[PDB]
Short mmCIF file of C-alpha atoms in Angstrom, two decimals:
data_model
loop_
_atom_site.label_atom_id
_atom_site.label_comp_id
_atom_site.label_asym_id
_atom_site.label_seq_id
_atom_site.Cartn_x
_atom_site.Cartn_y
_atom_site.Cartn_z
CA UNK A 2 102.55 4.31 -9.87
CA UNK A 3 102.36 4.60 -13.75
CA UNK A 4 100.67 1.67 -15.43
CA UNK A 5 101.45 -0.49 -19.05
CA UNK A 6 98.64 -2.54 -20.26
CA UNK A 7 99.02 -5.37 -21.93
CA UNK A 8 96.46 -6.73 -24.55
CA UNK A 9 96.50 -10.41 -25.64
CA UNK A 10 95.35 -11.05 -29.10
CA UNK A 11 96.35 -14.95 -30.12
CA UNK A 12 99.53 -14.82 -28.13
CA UNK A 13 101.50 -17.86 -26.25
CA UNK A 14 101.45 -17.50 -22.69
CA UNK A 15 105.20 -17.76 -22.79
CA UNK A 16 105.26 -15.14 -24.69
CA UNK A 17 103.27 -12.84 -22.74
CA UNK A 18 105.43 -14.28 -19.72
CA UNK A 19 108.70 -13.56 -21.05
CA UNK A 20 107.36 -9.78 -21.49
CA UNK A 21 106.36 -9.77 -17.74
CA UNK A 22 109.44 -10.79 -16.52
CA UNK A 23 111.21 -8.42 -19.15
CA UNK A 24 109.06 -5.56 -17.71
CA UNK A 25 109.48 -6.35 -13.80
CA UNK A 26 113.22 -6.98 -14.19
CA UNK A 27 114.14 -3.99 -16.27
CA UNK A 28 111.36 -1.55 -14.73
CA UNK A 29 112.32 -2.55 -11.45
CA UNK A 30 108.92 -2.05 -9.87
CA UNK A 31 108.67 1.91 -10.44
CA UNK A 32 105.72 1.18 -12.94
CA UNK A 33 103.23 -1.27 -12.51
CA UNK A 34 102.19 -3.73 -15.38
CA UNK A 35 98.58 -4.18 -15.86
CA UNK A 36 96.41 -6.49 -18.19
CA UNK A 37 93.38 -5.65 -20.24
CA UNK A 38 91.51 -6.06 -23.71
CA UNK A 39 91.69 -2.36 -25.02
CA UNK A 40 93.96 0.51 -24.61
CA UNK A 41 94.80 3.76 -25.84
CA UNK A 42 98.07 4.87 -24.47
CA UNK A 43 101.16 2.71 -22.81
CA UNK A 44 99.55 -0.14 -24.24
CA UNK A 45 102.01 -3.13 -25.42
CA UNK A 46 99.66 -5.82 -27.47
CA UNK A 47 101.04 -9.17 -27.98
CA UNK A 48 100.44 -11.77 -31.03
CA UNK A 49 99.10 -11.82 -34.50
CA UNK A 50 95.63 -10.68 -33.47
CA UNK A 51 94.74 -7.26 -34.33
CA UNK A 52 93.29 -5.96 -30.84
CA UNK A 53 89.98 -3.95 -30.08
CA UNK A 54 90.29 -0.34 -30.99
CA UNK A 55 93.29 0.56 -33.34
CA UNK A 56 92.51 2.07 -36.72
CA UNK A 57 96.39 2.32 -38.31
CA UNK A 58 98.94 -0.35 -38.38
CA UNK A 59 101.46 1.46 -38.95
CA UNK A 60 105.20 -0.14 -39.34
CA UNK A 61 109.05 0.99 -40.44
CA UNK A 62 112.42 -0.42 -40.59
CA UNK A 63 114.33 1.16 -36.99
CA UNK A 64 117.53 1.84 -37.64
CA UNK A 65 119.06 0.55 -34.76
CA UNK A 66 117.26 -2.95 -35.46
CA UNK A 67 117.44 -3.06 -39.21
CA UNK A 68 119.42 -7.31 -39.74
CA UNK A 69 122.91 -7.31 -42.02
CA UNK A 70 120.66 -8.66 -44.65
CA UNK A 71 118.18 -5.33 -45.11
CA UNK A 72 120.91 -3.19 -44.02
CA UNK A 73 119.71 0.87 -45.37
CA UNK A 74 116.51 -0.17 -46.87
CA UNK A 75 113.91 2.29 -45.85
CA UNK A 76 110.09 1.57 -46.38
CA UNK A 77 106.76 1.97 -44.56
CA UNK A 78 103.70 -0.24 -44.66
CA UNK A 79 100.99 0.90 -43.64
CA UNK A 80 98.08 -1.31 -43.12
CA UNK A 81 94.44 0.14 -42.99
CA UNK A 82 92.63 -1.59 -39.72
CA UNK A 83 88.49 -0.92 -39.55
CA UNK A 84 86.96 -1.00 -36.55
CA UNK A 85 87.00 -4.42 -34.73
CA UNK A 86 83.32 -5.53 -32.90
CA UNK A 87 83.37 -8.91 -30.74
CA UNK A 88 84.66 -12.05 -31.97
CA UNK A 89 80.78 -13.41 -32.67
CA UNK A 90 79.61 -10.98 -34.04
CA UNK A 91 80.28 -10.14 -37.86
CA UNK A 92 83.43 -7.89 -38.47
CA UNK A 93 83.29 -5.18 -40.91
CA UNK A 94 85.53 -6.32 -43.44
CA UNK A 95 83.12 -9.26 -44.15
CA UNK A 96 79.70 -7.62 -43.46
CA UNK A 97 80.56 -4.85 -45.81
CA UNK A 98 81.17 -7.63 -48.89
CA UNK A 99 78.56 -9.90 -47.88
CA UNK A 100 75.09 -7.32 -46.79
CA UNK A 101 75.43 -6.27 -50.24
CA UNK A 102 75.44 -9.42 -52.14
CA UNK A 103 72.57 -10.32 -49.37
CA UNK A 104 71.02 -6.86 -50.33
CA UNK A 105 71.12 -5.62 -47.23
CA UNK A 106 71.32 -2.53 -46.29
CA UNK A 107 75.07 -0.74 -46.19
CA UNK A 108 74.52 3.08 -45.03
CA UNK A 109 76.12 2.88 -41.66
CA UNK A 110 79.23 0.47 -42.59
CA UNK A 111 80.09 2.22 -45.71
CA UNK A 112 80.00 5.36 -43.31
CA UNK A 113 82.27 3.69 -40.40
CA UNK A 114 84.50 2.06 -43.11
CA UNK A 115 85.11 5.02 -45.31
CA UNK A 116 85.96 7.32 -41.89
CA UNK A 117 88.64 4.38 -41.35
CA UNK A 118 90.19 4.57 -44.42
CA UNK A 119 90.49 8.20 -44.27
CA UNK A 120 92.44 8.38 -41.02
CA UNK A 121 94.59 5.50 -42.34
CA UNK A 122 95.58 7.37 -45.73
CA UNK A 123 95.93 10.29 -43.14
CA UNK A 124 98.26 8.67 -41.98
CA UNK A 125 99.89 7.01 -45.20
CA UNK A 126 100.22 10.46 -46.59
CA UNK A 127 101.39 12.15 -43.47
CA UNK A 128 104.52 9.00 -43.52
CA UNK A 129 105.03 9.86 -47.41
CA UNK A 130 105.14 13.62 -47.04
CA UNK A 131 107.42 13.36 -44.30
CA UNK A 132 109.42 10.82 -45.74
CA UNK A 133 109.47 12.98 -48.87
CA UNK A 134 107.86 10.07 -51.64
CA UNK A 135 105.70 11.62 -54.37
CA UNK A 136 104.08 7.99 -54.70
CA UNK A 137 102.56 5.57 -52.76
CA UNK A 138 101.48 1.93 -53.63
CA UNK A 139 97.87 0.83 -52.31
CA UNK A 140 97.80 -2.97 -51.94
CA UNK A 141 94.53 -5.08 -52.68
CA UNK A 142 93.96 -8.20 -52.48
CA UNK A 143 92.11 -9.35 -56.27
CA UNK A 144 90.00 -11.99 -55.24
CA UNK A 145 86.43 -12.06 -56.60
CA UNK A 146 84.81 -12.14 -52.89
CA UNK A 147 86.15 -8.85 -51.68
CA UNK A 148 85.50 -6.93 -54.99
CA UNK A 149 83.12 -4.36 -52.56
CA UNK A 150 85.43 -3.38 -49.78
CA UNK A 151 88.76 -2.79 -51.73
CA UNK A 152 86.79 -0.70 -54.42
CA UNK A 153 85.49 1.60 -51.66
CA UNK A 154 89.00 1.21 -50.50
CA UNK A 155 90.47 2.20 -53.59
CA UNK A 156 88.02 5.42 -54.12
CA UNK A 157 88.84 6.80 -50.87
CA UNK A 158 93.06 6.30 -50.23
CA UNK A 159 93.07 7.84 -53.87
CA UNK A 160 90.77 10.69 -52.96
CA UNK A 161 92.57 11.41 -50.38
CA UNK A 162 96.25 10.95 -51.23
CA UNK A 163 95.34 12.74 -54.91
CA UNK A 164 93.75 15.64 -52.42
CA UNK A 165 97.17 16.18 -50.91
CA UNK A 166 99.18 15.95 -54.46
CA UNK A 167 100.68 12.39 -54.40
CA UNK A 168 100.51 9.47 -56.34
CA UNK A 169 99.11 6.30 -56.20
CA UNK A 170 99.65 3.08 -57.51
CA UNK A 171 97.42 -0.11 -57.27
CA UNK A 172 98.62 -3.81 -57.31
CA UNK A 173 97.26 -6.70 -55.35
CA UNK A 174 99.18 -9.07 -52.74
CA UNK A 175 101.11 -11.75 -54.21
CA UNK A 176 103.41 -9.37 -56.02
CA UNK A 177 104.10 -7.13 -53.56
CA UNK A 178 104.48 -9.21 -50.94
CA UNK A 179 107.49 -10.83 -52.71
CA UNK A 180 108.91 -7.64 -53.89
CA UNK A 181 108.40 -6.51 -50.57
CA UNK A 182 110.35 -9.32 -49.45
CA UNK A 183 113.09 -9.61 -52.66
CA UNK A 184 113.41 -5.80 -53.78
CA UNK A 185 111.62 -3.71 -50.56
CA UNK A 186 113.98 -0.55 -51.40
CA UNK A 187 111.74 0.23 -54.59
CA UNK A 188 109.04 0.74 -52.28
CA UNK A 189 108.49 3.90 -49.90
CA UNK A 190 105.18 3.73 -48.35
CA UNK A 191 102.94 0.89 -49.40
CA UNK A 192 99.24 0.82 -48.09
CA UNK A 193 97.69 -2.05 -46.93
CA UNK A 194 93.50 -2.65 -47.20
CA UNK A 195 92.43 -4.44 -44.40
CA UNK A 196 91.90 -8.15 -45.32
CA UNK A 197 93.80 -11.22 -43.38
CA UNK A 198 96.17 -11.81 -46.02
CA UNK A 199 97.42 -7.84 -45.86
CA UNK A 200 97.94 -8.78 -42.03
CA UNK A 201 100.14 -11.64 -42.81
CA UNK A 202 102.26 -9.77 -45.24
CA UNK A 203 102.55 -7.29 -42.57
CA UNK A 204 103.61 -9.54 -40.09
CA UNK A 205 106.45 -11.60 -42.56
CA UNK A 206 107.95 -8.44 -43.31
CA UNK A 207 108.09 -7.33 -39.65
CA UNK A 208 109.81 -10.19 -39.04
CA UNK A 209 111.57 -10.96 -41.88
CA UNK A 210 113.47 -7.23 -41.41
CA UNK A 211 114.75 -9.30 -37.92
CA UNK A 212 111.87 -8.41 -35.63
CA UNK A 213 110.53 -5.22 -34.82
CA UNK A 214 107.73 -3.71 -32.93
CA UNK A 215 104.20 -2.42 -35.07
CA UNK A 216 102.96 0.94 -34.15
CA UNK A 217 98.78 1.22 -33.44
CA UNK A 218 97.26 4.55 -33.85
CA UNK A 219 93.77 3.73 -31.96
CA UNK A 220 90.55 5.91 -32.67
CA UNK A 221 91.52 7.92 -29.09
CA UNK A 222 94.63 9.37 -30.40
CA UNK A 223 97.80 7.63 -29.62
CA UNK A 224 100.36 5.42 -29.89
CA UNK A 225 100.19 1.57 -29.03
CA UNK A 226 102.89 -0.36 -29.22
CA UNK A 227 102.56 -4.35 -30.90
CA UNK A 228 105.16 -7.50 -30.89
CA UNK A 229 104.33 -11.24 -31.66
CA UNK A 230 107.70 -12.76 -30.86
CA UNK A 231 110.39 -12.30 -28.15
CA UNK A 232 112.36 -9.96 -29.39
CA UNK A 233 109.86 -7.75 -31.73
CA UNK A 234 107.72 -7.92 -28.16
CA UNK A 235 110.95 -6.95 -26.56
CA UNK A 236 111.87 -3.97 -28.76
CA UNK A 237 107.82 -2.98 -28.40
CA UNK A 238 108.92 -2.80 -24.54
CA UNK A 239 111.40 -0.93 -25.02
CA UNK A 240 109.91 1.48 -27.15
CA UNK A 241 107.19 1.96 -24.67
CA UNK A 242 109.28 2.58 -21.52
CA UNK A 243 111.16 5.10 -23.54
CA UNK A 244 107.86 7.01 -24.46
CA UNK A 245 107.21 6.76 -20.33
CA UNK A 246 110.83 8.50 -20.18
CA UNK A 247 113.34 6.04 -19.40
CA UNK A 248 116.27 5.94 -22.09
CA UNK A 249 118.92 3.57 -20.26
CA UNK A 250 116.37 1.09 -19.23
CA UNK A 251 114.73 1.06 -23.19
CA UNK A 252 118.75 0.46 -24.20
CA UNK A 253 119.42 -1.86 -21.81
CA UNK A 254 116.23 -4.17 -23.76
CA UNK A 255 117.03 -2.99 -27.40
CA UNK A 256 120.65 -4.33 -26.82
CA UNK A 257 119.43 -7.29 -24.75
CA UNK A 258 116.68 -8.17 -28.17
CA UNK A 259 119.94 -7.60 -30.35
CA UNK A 260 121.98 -9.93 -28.62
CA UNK A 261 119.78 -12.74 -27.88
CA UNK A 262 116.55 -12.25 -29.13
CA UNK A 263 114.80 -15.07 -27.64
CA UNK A 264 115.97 -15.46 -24.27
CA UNK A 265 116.20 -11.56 -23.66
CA UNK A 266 115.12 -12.16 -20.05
CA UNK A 267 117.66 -13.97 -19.00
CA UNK A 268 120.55 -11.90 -21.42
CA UNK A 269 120.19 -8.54 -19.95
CA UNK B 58 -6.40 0.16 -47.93
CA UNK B 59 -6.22 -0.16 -51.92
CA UNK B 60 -3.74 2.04 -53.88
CA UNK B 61 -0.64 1.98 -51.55
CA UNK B 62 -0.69 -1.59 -50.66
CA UNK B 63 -1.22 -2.64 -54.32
CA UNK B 64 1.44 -0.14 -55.91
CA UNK B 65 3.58 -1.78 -52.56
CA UNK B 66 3.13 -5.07 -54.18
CA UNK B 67 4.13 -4.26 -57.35
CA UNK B 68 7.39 -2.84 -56.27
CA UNK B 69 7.95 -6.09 -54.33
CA UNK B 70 9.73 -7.97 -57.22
CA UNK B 71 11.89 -5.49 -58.72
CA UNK B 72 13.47 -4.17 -55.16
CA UNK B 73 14.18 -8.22 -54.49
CA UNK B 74 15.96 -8.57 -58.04
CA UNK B 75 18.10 -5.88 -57.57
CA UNK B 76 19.02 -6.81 -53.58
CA UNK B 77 19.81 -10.08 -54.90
CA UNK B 78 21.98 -8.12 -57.10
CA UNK B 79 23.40 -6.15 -54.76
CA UNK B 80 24.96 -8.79 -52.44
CA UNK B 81 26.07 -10.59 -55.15
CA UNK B 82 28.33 -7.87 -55.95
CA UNK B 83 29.29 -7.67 -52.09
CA UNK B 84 30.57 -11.25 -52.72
CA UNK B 85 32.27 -11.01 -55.56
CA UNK B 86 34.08 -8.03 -54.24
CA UNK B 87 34.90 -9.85 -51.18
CA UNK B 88 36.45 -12.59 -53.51
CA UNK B 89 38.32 -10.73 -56.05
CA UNK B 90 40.16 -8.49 -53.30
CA UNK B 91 41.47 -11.72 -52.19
CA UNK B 92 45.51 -12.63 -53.38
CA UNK B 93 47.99 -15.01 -51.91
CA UNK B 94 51.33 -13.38 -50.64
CA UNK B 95 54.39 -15.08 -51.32
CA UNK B 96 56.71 -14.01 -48.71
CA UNK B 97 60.79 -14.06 -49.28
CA UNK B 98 63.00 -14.81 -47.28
CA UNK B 99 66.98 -14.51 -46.78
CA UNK B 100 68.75 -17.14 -48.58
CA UNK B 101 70.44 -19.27 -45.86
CA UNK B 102 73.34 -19.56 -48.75
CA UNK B 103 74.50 -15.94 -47.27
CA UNK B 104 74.70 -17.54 -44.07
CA UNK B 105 76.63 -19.94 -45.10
CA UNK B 106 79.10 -18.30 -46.96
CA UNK B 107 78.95 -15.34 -43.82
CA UNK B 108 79.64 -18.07 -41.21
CA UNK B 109 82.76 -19.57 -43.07
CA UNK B 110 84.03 -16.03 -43.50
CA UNK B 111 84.22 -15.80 -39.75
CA UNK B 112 86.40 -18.87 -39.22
CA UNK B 113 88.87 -16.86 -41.36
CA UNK B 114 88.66 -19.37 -44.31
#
């Protein structure tokens, strides 16, 4: 009756196997499991890939999940996703740093980026305010190429965030990546621009933390759910079922992903 | 038969002279209105540099 869709983005077919069988064995049938591109609710997205229609990569440190070594630390990155057009054509984050050195014109995708980055420090504020941090730390990368899009990313999280009475606190990606990964409790909500290394950085500490699931919050208004290995795609399962209503069957997986996070299927 | 033709004929060389005149400046108008347009167009450099941005290097 109820439906999950799945998106592929750069995922293994065994990995987007092993969350089938998860699904079927654990759901039991009840709900069926569909596959598509783009989603805006019950959606589970599997690999690196950022999908087709998410604007907020938002990700924490569960509780429940949190590995011996990061035991208590508590931070959220949030990294800022513009909107994604087919795979030929030019994306976004490019044509906004290359029209202008081309001397193109830049009306429209200065408009489209800048209502991005406005939902995503939305967002980043909303995280810090209910986390209770007076500051935040924007991430940029500092090479010379994108010098265009993280300077209109700059002058709008700061607009914002300085609109709602917080803080903010620029650094590029080298150094915060590796106090993200050394020293993360320092850090309470770090913004991410949207470049590919940011969506590494997000992806090492989401794993690095011992796998957990990335939250989407697409331009319809929801909640997506995002794993790239077997057991962050397993927790992203489970998260999902629960938001369907289903408590024992989401335990059931998070203690299956705990115990044996790459042959979940089989463990629970 | 006498006065017209005669004054007629002594307009004759003037009226020449300055139609002479006259198209000569239609020519030379038609010349000097004349320029070469350099057209521009995109550096393919852009391209370049836009294409390897999409292979994610």
């Amino acid at each position: 009756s109820k439906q999950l869709t799945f998106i592929s983005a750069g995922a293994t077919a065994a990995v987007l196997q092993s969350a089938s069988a998860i699904v079927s064995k654990v759901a039991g049938g009840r709900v069926q499991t569909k596959t598509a591109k783009e989603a805006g609710r019950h959606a589970v997205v599997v690999g690196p890939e950022t999908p087709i229609g998410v604007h907020t990569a938002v990700t924490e440190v569960p509780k429940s999940a949190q590995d011996p070594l990061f035991s208590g630390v508590s931070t959220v990155v949030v990294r800022a996703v513009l909107p994604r057009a087919a795979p030929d054509s030019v994306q976004l984050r490019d044509a906004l740093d290359v029209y202008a050195s081309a001397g193109i014109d830049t009306k429209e995708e200065v408009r489209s980026a800048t209502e991005a980055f406005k939902k995503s420090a939305e967002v980043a504020v909303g995280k810090a305010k209910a986390k209770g941090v007076k500051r935040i730390v924007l991430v940029v990368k500092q090479a010379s190429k994108h010098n265009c899009i993280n300077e209109l990313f700059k002058k709008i999280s700061t607009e914002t965030i300085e609109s709602a009475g917080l803080t903010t606190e620029v650094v590029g990606t080298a150094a915060v990546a590796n106090q993200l990964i050394v020293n993360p409790e320092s850090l309470g909500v770090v913004l991410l621009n949207d470049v590919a290394a940011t969506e590494q950085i997000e992806l090492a500490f989401a794993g690095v933390v011992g796998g957990v699931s990335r939250v989407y919050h697409t331009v319809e208004g929801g909640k997506i759910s995002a794993g790239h290995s077997f057991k962050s795609v397993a927790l992203a399962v489970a998260q999902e079922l629960r938001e369907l209503g289903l408590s024992s069957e989401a335990d059931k997986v998070e203690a299956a992903a705990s115990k044996n996070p790459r042959a979940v299927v089989s463990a629970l | 038969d006498i006065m017209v033709p005669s004054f007629v004929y002594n307009k004759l060389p003037v009226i020449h002279f300055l139609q002479e005149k006259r198209a000569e400046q239609k020519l030379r108008r038609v010349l000097d209105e004349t320029y070469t347009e350099w057209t521009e167009e995109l550096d393919q450099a852009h391209v370049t540099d836009a294409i390897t941005r999409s292979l994610n290097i």
